[PDB]
Amino acid sequence: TKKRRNNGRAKKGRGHVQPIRCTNCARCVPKDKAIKKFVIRNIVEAAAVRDISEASVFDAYVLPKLYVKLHYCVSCAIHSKVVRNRSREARKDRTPPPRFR
Amino acid sequence: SLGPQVAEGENVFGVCHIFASFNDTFVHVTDLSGKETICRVTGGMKVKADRDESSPYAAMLAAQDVAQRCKELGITALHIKLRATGGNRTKTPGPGAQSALRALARSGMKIGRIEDVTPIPSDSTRRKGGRRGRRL
Amino acid sequence: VVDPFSKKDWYDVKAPAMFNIRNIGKTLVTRTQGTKIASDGLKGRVFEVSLADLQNDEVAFRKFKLITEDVQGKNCLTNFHGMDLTRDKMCSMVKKWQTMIEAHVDVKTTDGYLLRLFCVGFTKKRNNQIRKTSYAQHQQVRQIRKKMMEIMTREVQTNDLKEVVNKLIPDSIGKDIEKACQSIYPLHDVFVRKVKMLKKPKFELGKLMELHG
Amino acid sequence: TSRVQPIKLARVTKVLGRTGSQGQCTQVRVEFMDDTSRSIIRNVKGPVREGDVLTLLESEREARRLR
Amino acid sequence: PLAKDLLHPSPEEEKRKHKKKRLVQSPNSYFMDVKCPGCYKITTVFSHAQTVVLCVGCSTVLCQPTGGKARLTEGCSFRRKQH
Amino acid sequence: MRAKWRKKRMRRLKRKRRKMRQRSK
RNA sequence: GCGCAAGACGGACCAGAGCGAAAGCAUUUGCCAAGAAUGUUUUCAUUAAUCAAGAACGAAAGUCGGAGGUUCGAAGACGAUCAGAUACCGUCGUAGUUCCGACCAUAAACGAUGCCGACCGGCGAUGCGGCGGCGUUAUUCCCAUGACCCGCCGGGCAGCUUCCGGGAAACCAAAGUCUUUGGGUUCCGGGGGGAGUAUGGUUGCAAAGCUGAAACUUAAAGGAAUUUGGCGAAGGGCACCACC
Ligand SMILES: [Zn+2]
Numbered sequence: 001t002k003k004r005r006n007n008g009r010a011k012k013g014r015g016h017v018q019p020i021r022c023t024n025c026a027r028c029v030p031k032d033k034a035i036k037k038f039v040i041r042n043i044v045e046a047a048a049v050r051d052i053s054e055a056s057v058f059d060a061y062v063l064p065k066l067y068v069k070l071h072y073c074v075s076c077a078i079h080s081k082v083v084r085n086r087s088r089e090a091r092k093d094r095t096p097p098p099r100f101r
Numbered sequence: 102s103l104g105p106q107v108a109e110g111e112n113v114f115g116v117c118h119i120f121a122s123f124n125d126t127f128v129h130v131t132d133l134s135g136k137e138t139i140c141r142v143t144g145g146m147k148v149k150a151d152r153d154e155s156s157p158y159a160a161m162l163a164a165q166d167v168a169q170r171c172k173e174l175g176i177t178a179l180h181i182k183l184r185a186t187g188g189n190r191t192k193t194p195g196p197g198a199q200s201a202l203r204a205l206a207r208s209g210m211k212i213g214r215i216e217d218v219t220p221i222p223s224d225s226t227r228r229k230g231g232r233r234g235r236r237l
Numbered sequence: 238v239v240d241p242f243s244k245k246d247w248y249d250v251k252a253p254a255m256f257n258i259r260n261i262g263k264t265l266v267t268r269t270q271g272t273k274i275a276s277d278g279l280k281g282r283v284f285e286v287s288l289a290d291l292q293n294d295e296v297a298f299r300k301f302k303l304i305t306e307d308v309q310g311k312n313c314l315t316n317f318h319g320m321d322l323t324r325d326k327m328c329s330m331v332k333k334w335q336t337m338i339e340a341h342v343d344v345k346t347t348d349g350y351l352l353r354l355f356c357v358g359f360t361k362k363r364n365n366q367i368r369k370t371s372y373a374q375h376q377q378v379r380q381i382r383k384k385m386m387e388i389m390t391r392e393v394q395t396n397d398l399k400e401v402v403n404k405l406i407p408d409s410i411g412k413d414i415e416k417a418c419q420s421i422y423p424l425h426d427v428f429v430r431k432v433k434m435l436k437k438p439k440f441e442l443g444k445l446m447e448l449h450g
Numbered sequence: 451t452s453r454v455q456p457i458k459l460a461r462v463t464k465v466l467g468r469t470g471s472q473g474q475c476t477q478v479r480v481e482f483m484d485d486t487s488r489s490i491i492r493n494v495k496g497p498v499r500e501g502d503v504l505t506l507l508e509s510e511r512e513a514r515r516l517r
Numbered sequence: 518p519l520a521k522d523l524l525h526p527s528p529e530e531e532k533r534k535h536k537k538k539r540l541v542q543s544p545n546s547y548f549m550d551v552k553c554p555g556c557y558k559i560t561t562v563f564s565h566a567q568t569v570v571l572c573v574g575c576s577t578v579l580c581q582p583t584g585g586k587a588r589l590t591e592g593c594s595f596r597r598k599q600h
Numbered sequence: 601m602r603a604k605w606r607k608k609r610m611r612r613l614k615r616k617r618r619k620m621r622q623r624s625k
Numbered sequence: 626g627c628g629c630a631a632g633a634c635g636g637a638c639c640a641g642a643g644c645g646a647a648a649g650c651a652u653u654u655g656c657c658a659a660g661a662a663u664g665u666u667u668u669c670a671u672u673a674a675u676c677a678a679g680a681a682c683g684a685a686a687g688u689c690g691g692a693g694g695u696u697c698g699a700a701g702a703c704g705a706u707c708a709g710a711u712a713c714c715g716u717c718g719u720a721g722u723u724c725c726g727a728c729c730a731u732a733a734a735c736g737a738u739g740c741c742g743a744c745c746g747g748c749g750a751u752g753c754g755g756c757g758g759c760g761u762u763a764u765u766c767c768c769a770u771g772a773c774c775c776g777c778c779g780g781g782c783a784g785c786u787u788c789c790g791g792g793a794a795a796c797c798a799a800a801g802u803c804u805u806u807g808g809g810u811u812c813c814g815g816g817g818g819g820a821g822u823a824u825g826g827u828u829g830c831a832a833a834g835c836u837g838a839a840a841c842u843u844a845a846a847g848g849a850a851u852u853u854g855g856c857g858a859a860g861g862g863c864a865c866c867a868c869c
Pocket of ligand 1: 022023024025026072073074075076077
């Protein structure tokens with residue numbers, strides 16, 4: 001039984017792409033098949049941001065962020081509840097969930 | 102053993118490295134040039150249990166040790182230099198760096214520019230493991 | 238066992254007149270024991286700073302490498318060694334669905350100072366644009382890289398280190414880059430990301446005194 | 451550890467849902483009357499009606515969800 | 518369309534279509550003539566030159582080879598001829 | 601019963617039969 | 626933290642994007658050679674399509690000779706896990722991994738769908754080249770130039786929808802134009818095991834690659850989808866025969 005419209009990745013005219021490595025795993029999943037994440041994280045999220053700011057010598061100093069990205073294998077991503085399964089009638093929904101915060 | 106800088110005029114500025122992996126926490130402090138050090142402390146200094154090597158309490162105790170050492174030496178303002186693991190293993194640091202920095206800010210020191218000095222490669226050699234991964 | 242802070246001196250360095258703020262920090266070297274002089278121990282030192290610690294009130298996300306050259310007692314004289322941006326700014330300016338252009342020329346100055354200037358460039362998305370892709374062809378990037386290398390190697394080979402640094406404290410090379418490269422494809426973000434030094438001439442003292450005034 | 455905790459008083463206004471491993475810890479939103487600018491969220495075990503004064507001895511850290 | 522008449526549509530319909538999908542078969546390019554502003558002799562040139570051409574008398578080059586139609590030298594008067 | 605290790609073991613017995621037929625003279 | 630030295634690789638930029646017959650291909654620069662598409666009122670004039678013989682290329686792993694081999698890492702060595710592990714896990718670790726030659730021609734080398742050519746609907750996008758048309762950007766006026774926008778043309782990866790139509794259904798704008806059955810052409814299969822097995826030939830130093838049985842047993846082996854199952858699957862709600 002064929003499952004999807006595509007083959008499950010972003011290979012449609014190439015045949016082979018470069019392999020990448022997972023973060024919590026080490027599987028050599030291809031780049032067009034894996035799951036990426038462009039996460040933005042501050043140095044202090046909500047824990048002691050006022051304690052950091054009031055201890056700062058420089059007036060009007062803003063904390064920087066950490067723009068790092070991670071690569072997940074499919075089993076590693078489904079174990080960490082990153083992606084979730086759904087039904088067949090809504091499986092053709094490429095649109096991401098909405099962003100608010 | 103004592104510095105000629107006055108505690109009423111301005112504050113001195115050193116740099117301190119924090120290396121915070123998923124199972125180890127280093128808190129090291131050196132001079133501004135980085136040639137010579139001041140003191141150093143790991144997570145597993147007083148807590149002899151291995152399981153607390155990556156814990157908020159060990160990082161908090163390490164930051165208190167740096168706090169007491171820098172207060173008896175007279176070092177007030179610090180630049181925090183954060184390192185996650187180094188190399189091609191991971192990129193996101195653990196939760197020990199957060200507790201170490203908030204315990205440094207809790208004691209009473211002053212902070213300046215903070216940044217990340219993680220040795221990011223262009224791309225390194227083969228990762229420690231196999232093709233199928235570190236399954237468990 | 239015993240604290241060696243009894244044998245611990247306290248020295249200070251001085252920024253050149255090419256900057257504005259003279260004092261940047263302090264160092265803690267040990268004493269002199271005849272066979273172990275502390276004069277050479279102050280030689281091999283690189284000081285890491287920011288822009289607001291040296292110049293006046295403007296934006297500050299750049300770093301400067303400062304290496305000492307000679308000491309005579311209770312003071313140190315330094316000089317330019319390298320320049321670099323912030324890693325946070327570098328990893329923030331990398332945008333998805335935008336291309337990046339880089340170039341380098343090992344350009345030699347008037348004196349024996351040899352540098353290695355790096356450059357980076359990102360294209361500009363227009364306000365009228367509806368297409369989200371906004372890429373450029375390979376020959377466009379090649380000609381942009383050729384113009385960038387020629388402009389960057391023209392401004393360094395004609396002058397000494399102090400003049401090109403004083404041109405490098407504001408954005409003059411970058412202002413020339415988005416002045417001259419917008420005729421082929423509009424780009425908005427060019428910083429000199431890193432300047433690496435390779436070789437120096439014979440060591441002297443008049444240059445070291447004249448960079449401080 | 452040499453920390454001092456001054457006596458500060460709180461008064462609840464809104465109550466959030468009831469958390470915990472077995473489901474007994476209650477998340478509440480307090481409002482100080484020493485100053486009308488600081489509100490902290492903690493865990494309380496017991497009946498709390500909205501608009502009732504609450505006792506505190508230390509206030510520097512918030513509360514997690516379950517563990 | 519059901520009863521789409523392909524005998525004689527509007528000329529815009531044959532204009533928008535391809536040169537070979539057109540039901541009466543005819544190309545789109547044409548012949549032209551153009552002179553030099555400081556000369557008397559005027560010569561003819563095809564719309565797609567594919568070689569660089571100069572006007573007679575060996576005074577000033579006239580056209581330039583492009584992927585499409587040949588672009589003319591600035592400041593030259595011309596008109597399309599037809600028969 | 602999958603085909604890979606079945607084919608591997610049966611290739612091993614193929615090689616054993618080949619060497620036995622070689623040295624059977 | 627500062628220098629020296631070796632080897633490997635070129636992240637983020639990198640996309641349901643490009644190129645190539647496929648296997649495959651990402652630091653800049655310099656040289657050589659080839660090619661799709663676009664445009665053409667240029668030239669030869671049937672040079673055409675598919676192909677038994679035969680031929681080229683071909684991921685990794687494998688064998689023969691070398692300088693040199695960072696990191697990772699078959700077989701193996703040492704500890705914990707385990708009723709029992711010579712498995713998962715950790716530390717070392719040889720052959721290998723990279724380069725120059727010499728070879729076998731095997732993958733889920735899969736779009737599990739041969740090539741050419743004609744036809745049958747739409748929508749909005751991206752990539753190349755050409756084309757027409759408001760208005761902005763390279764010291765304020767024109768021109769074509771690079772970019773922005775609105776439409777058209779040809780080829781390619783495509784996406785959405787469609788009682789066109791097809792199919793056992795999954796699904797397909799081809800897997801359609803088929804009992805209303807014939808466009809041209811190459812390879813290839815008749816219930817399931819035995820068995821890609823033995824023999825024979827063939828190539829190879831080497832592993833094996835190609836070719837390819839018989840006896841006997843067997844009435845099922847298989848493909849699609851539905852109904853409550855049953856999940857150390859996910860997500861909601863309830864119970865003091867559950868908990869606080
Ligand atoms: Zn994983």
